[PDB]
Amino acid sequence: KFFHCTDESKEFEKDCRGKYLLYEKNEVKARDREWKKYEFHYDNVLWA
Amino acid sequence: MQLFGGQFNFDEGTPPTNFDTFPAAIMTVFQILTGEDWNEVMYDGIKS
Amino acid sequence: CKGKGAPCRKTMYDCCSGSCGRRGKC
Amino acid sequence: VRLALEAEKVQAAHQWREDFASNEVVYYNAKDDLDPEKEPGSQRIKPVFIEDANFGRQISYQHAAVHIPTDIYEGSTIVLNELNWTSALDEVFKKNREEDPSLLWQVFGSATGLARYYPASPWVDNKIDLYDVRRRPWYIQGAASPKDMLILVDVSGSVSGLTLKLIRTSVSEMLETLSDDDFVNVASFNSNAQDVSCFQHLVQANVRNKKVLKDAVNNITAKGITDYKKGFSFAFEQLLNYNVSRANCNKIIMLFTDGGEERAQEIFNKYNKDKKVRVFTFSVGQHNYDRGPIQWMACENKGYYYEIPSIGAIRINTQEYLDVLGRPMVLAGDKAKQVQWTNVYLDALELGLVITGTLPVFNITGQFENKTNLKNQLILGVMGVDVSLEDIKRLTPRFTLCPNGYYFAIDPNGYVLLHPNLQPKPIGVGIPTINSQEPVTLDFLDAELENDIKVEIRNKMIDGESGEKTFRTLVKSQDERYIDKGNRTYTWTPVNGTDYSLALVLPTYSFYYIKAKLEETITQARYSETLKPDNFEESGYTFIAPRDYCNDLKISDNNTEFLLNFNEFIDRKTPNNPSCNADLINRVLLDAGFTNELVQNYWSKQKNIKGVKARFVVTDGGITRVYPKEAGENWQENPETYEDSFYKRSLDNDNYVFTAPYFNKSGPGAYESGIMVSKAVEIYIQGKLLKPAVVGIKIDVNSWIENF
Amino acid sequence: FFGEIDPSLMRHLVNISVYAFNKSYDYQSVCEPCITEQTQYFFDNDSKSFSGVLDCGNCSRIFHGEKLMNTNLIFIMVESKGTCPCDTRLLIQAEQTSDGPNPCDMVKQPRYRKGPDVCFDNNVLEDYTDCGGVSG
Ligand SMILES: *[C@@H]1O[C@H](CO)[C@@H](O[C@@H]2O[C@H](CO)[C@@H](O[C@@H]3O[C@H](CO)[C@@H](O[C@@H]4O[C@H](CO)[C@@H](O)[C@H](O)[C@H]4NC(C)=O)[C@H](O)[C@H]3NC(C)=O)[C@H](O)[C@H]2NC(C)=O)[C@H](O)[C@H]1NC(C)=O
Numbered sequence: 001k002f003f004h005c006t007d008e009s010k011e012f013e014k015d016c017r018g019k020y021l022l023y024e025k026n027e028v029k030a031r032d033r034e035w036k037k038y039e040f041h042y043d044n045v046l047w048a
Numbered sequence: 049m050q051l052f053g054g055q056f057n058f059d060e061g062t063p064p065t066n067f068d069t070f071p072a073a074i075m076t077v078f079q080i081l082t083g084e085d086w087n088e089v090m091y092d093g094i095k096s
Numbered sequence: 097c098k099g100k101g102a103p104c105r106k107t108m109y110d111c112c113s114g115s116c117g118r119r120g121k122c
Numbered sequence: 123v124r125l126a127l128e129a130e131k132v133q134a135a136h137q138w139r140e141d142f143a144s145n146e147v148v149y150y151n152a153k154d155d156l157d158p159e160k161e162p163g164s165q166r167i168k169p170v171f172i173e174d175a176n177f178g179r180q181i182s183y184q185h186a187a188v189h190i191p192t193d194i195y196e197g198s199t200i201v202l203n204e205l206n207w208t209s210a211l212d213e214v215f216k217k218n219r220e221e222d223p224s225l226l227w228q229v230f231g232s233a234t235g236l237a238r239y240y241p242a243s244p245w246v247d248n249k250i251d252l253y254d255v256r257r258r259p260w261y262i263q264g265a266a267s268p269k270d271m272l273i274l275v276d277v278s279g280s281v282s283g284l285t286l287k288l289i290r291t292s293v294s295e296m297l298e299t300l301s302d303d304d305f306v307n308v309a310s311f312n313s314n315a316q317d318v319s320c321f322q323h324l325v326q327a328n329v330r331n332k333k334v335l336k337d338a339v340n341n342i343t344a345k346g347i348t349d350y351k352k353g354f355s356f357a358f359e360q361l362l363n364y365n366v367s368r369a370n371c372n373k374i375i376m377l378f379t380d381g382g383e384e385r386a387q388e389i390f391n392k393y394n395k396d397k398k399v400r401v402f403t404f405s406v407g408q409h410n411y412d413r414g415p416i417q418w419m420a421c422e423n424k425g426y427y428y429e430i431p432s433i434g435a436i437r438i439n440t441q442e443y444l445d446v447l448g449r450p451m452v453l454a455g456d457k458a459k460q461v462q463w464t465n466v467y468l469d470a471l472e473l474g475l476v477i478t479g480t481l482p483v484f485n486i487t488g489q490f491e492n493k494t495n496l497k498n499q500l501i502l503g504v505m506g507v508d509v510s511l512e513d514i515k516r517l518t519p520r521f522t523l524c525p526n527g528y529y530f531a532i533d534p535n536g537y538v539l540l541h542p543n544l545q546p547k548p549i550g551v552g553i554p555t556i557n558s559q560e561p562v563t564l565d566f567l568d569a570e571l572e573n574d575i576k577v578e579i580r581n582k583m584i585d586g587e588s589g590e591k592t593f594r595t596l597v598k599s600q601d602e603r604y605i606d607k608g609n610r611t612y613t614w615t616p617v618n619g620t621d622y623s624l625a626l627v628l629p630t631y632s633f634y635y636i637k638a639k640l641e642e643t644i645t646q647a648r649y650s651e652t653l654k655p656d657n658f659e660e661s662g663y664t665f666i667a668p669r670d671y672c673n674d675l676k677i678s679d680n681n682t683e684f685l686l687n688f689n690e691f692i693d694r695k696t697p698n699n700p701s702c703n704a705d706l707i708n709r710v711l712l713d714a715g716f717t718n719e720l721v722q723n724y725w726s727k728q729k730n731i732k733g734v735k736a737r738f739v740v741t742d743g744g745i746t747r748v749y750p751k752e753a754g755e756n757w758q759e760n761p762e763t764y765e766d767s768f769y770k771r772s773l774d775n776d777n778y779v780f781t782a783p784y785f786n787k788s789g790p791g792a793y794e795s796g797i798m799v800s801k802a803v804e805i806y807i808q809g810k811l812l813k814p815a816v817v818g819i820k821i822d823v824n825s826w827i828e829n830f
Numbered sequence: 831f832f833g834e835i836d837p838s839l840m841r842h843l844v845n846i847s848v849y850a851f852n853k854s855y856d857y858q859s860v861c862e863p864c865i866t867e868q869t870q871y872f873f874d875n876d877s878k879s880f881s882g883v884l885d886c887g888n889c890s891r892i893f894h895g896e897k898l899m900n901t902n903l904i905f906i907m908v909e910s911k912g913t914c915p916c917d918t919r920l921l922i923q924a925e926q927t928s929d930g931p932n933p934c935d936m937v938k939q940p941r942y943r944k945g946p947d948v949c950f951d952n953n954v955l956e957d958y959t960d961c962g963g964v965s966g
Pocket residue numbers: 138139140485486487494495496497498502
């Protein structure tokens with residue numbers, strides 16, 4: 001349950017492909033969508 | 049909640065460690081006691 | 097989940113990787 | 123029409139595949155680098171672009187291109203499924219161009235976001251592409267009907283902070299989706315509702331009213347405790363005001379809030395029992411309030427429910443209400459399919475001023491046999507073909523009239539389709555505050571507004587009638603410094619079948635024109651031996667108007683190149699036969715002969731005169747002959763005869779006209795060039811009146827100083 | 831423009847109806863920092879005598895104006911400008927960047943127009959289940 005998409009709108013992994021837009025102040029830029037795991041997670045007893 | 053209850057609606061969003069509701073207030077107080085990021089919370093209180 | 101290099105506030109904890117940096121950017 | 127029929131049939135024949143072999147769909151994507159030297163279901167095309175002067179860009183006729191916006195993935199299942207059934211449109215795209223070679227663009231906007239235009243050209247060349255075919259004005263026009271929109275913004279303590287900024291941006295963007303045919307007013311309500319701007323009832327969604335509403339919503343504040351029962355009772359009253367002008371259909375209310383607990387059943391049961399007013403509810407921002415009531419209001423009152431959690435969702439969640447609005451025109455069958463032309467706007471692919479005809483496409487899977495109607499109430503997309511204003515100007519020749527005569531056409535909203543003072547620039551909206559998507563809508567009365575006559579004429583042409591009106595008017599000079607009180611004759615007639623109304627303005631002295639004779643091959647010889655580059659020494663520097671005479675002949679900005687090309691053309695062929703404009707060339711050479719005879723016989727007798735600096739002559743027929751050699755460099759006038767301010771000024775005056783020079787300008791002042799005085803040449807062939815030329819004098823400043 | 835050089839005499843000429851003025855708005859114009867206002871002057875009395883007194887700044891300057899018959903020029907001769915001080919309030923004729931007409935007054939008296947008559951806004955066969963709340 002510690003999987004997140006670089007674009008928060010796309011909930012599932014199959015959706016997280018292509019390019020998405022960032023709206024930061026006084027600019028509009030486009031970056032890749034990436035399906036990533038959080039840096040600290042709970043996947044096995046060692047990671048926990 | 050009396051001092052900072054209604055003034056964490058900043059232009060960048062409401063912080064998770066807000067004093068809006070009671071369950072949110074308890075966690076913010078608990079976090080300060082453990083000492084993690086108590087200065088960042090204080091910065092929000094001063095800015096508010 | 098704000099992107100890297102976007103203005104950030106540490107209390108938000110919304111930064112995608114790591115945390116909000118000293119200079120105020122992810 | 124035929125494109126829509128083919129698209130409907132092919133989409134009806136399609137199968138919903140959900141598995142592609144990574145190479146099954148083939149297209150161009152119109153946005154990839156031409157040299158990658160290197161996808162989930164697609165195989166790219168490397169096309170060949172040569173050139174085309176008809177477009178200015180580099181085009182390929184072998185296939186159509188596809189534009190998929192940055193936000194949307196290029197390899198999702200729905201996109202690939204559309205690519206298959208839209209690959210069939212390429213043959214019809216080719217066929218239509220084969221029938222009529224003059225077609226510029228043939229675009230198919232899709233409900234999913236991709237667009238296919240036939241002439242394959244790369245997308246436009248800070249380079250983040252924000253284009254979305256579902257937001258362009260032609261798509262919005264063809265996807266629904268004119269609306270009566272009342273945005274009901276919610277101001278309250280809760281919406282303070284980020285939610286207020288998101289509401290501001292969302293209101294601005296959704297305002298950007300309206301058109302001239304649509305009426306909009308923005309309201310707000312904390313505890314008692316009030317209008318956000320000076321407007322009180324409803325205003326047409328012009329380019330000015332929209333700006334006023336945007337400023338008013340950008341100057342908004344959040345206070346108080348929300349009361350829905352007053353805001354809705356206010357909106358419903360402003361949607362019942364019939365004292366003013368409105369589209370009178372598609373009455374729709376937009377509620378921009380975050381969330382609450384009141385559903386206000388009594389207000390809806392009081393105002394909207396027959397369900398004639400749609401309600402769309404938007405839950406803006408990231409919050410934890412109860413969104414249940416607003417969904418219920420969107421369900422009971424015919425509508426749909428949206429959510430905007432961040433800036434990146436504003437565009438999509440504000441451009442979707444047209445999908446709901448287009449259901450009744452889908453269910454109308456083959457009766458809502460009428461070609462409807464948009465306003466004049468700048469093409470997205472750098473083509474200038476164009477207008478677009480739009481035709482919706484319906485989803486007709488399972489139409490022949492009566493099973494499927496679940497999703498058959500949404501449009502597939504809107505077709506579109508672009509016709510440039512240059513073609514329409516070509517259909518209305520203006521070289522048989524005087525420079526003071528012209529055509530103009532008006533749509534039912536009053537905006538000009540053709541007019542000499544219409545230029546390819548966006549319409550100004552106000553003073554430029556310190557620190558290309560909008561239509562070019564210029565009203566007819568923004569040429570020279572006259573209360574008595576040019577208002578009734580405009581109202582008659584808008585109504586779709588024909589008549590004539592001769593009256594004494596005021597005309598503004600081309601240099602925008604002088605005004606003449608001339609006599610003009612407005613004649614208008616409707617363009618039947620469409621809604622535009624064409625008119626022709628003609629002064630009294632322009633009721634006749636000189637048509638040149640065929641003459642003979644000998645006349646061509648010595649009428650051409652006058653304007654040679656080495657020959658304008660004893661005849662004075664000779665100009666020529668860049669009017670297209672021959673198809674091979676090319677217009678050039680520099681006059682010397684055009685003069686040389688004209689000389690070589692008239693030498694190398696006869697004028698009339700090689701599919702050229704016989705009348706234009708014949709009249710140009712007739713003017714050349716007349717002017718050469720004049721300059722030689724009269725001006726050559728007196729080489730120098732005490733008070734004159736240059737003797738010039740300009741004739742209707744695109745030739746100008748400044749007699750002094752050194753004075754030819756000071757001629758700053760337009761080589762085109764029909765665009766000379768002094769020529770048009772002198773035509774309207776029965777006496778001598780003095781043209782004041784320019785002050786504090788980088789060009790030569792009135793001390794080495796002189797003061798320009800011009801007189802209009804007047805002739806009486808038979809009893810008729812004609813003014814085919816204007817002559818003049820450049821007065822020496824020092825001589826007149828010592829004479830004064 | 832003679833308004834820039836001698837504003838008082840130009841204003842007096844306009845007041846005694848020598849140069850008529852009436853202005854237009856240019857919407858397709860560019861500005862350095864846009865709607866632009868324009869002004870043009872012309873004749874409106876087609877007569878010749880045109881004699882009056884300025885009474886400018888308690889230093890009256892008698893002026894005589896005659897128009898050349900065949901040309902479109904006018905000869906105006908004033909007593910002096912520098913000797914008699916007056917207000918300047920320069921009368922510019924050049925295009926100036928300014929806001930257009932007030933939109934509120936304009937929409938109070940809208941121009942004539944004919945909207946499209948075809949409209950499809952309701953139909954009993956339309957399905958209303960796609961509300962958006964249950965679909966997400
Ligand atoms: C024009 O209208 C026609 C019908 O009027 C329409 O064709 C229909 O398209 C839909 C897809 O949008 C097909 O839907 C089928 O339904 C199944 C079951 O739901 C889907 O399989 C999963 O569905 C879930 C959600 O239910 C979703 O995650 C995803 O769609 C699927 N998930 C996975 C893991 O596969 C399929 O989408 C689909 N089934 C199959 C076997 O493909 C209808 O079947 C289509 N109906 C007909 C008669 O063809 C068409 O799209 C409309 N035109 C346009 C341009 O949209």
